[PDB]
Amino acid sequence: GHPTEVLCLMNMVLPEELLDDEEYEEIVEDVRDECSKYGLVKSIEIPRPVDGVEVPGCGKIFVEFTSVFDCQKAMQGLTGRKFANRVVVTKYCDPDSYHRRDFW
């Protein structure tokens, strides 16, 4: 719809996974190596509910990109896909609220 700078990816994770040490770190790795396949990624932020401390909303990860170009080509392949068995909703996020960390 419109490229900004940051790329958001939700409906692809669950608190039942972002609650373990190796499990949570697992997604962080795959998600990082994946986003860094179309271009360069500044960083990534993933929720980590402490024994269910941040479950409320948990399940939404985002990635800080460097160039909107590789960002476009990024979701152009990981959109509507399946991180495991569910569709992944990708929505271009703005560096504004992103840094605001309105999520976690």
Partner: peptide
């Protein structure tokens, strides 16, 4: 890459 689990993300297209 990875450590225990295998890579099986994005499966549709």
């Amino acid at each position: 890459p990875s450590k225990k689990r295998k890579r099986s993300r994005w499966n549709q297209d």
